[PDB]
Paper text:
Unlike most Kazal-family serine proteinase inhibitors, where each functional domain consists of 50–60 amino acid residues with six conserved cysteines, [name]-2 is a single domain inhibitor of 36 residues with only four cysteines. [name]-2 has been classified as a non-classical Kazal-family serine proteinase inhibitor group 1.
The number of reflections per parameter justified refinement without any stereochemical restraints for the well-ordered parts of the inhibitor. The fully exposed reactive site loop (RSL) of the inhibitor presents the P1 site with the Thr7 residue. The [name]-2 RSL has an additional strong (2.86 Å) hydrogen bond stabilizing the RSL between Thr6 (O) and Trp25 (Nε). The crystal structure includes four partially occupied sodium ions. The coordination number of Na103 and Na104 is 5 and 4, respectively. These sodium ions are coordinated by oxygen atoms belonging to the [name]-2 molecule (Thr7 Oγ1, Asp16 O and Asp34 O and Oδ1), as well as by water molecules. The His-tag cleavage site was located between Leu40, and Ser41 of the fusion protein. c electron density map for Leu40, the last residue of the mature inhibitor, is excellent for both the main-chain and side-chain atoms including the C-terminal oxygen atoms O and OXT. This clearly confirms the sequence specificity of the presented tag cleavage procedure.
Numbering used by the authors: 1 to 40
Write the structure that this text describes.
Amino acid sequence: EAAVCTTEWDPVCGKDGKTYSNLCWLNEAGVGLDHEGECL
Ligand code: NA
Ligand code: NA
Ligand code: NA
Ligand code: NA
């Protein structure tokens, strides 16, 4: 699959309980945003 997101770490927390490295990773995955920042 095309690699479309950068590795710039500005993490967000998906509703799936996984930390995504930045919003592009989250959005490309189709996962809803829980909150900004790392999941905890
Ligand atoms: Na493929
Ligand atoms: Na990179
Ligand atoms: Na999960
Ligand atoms: Na939330």
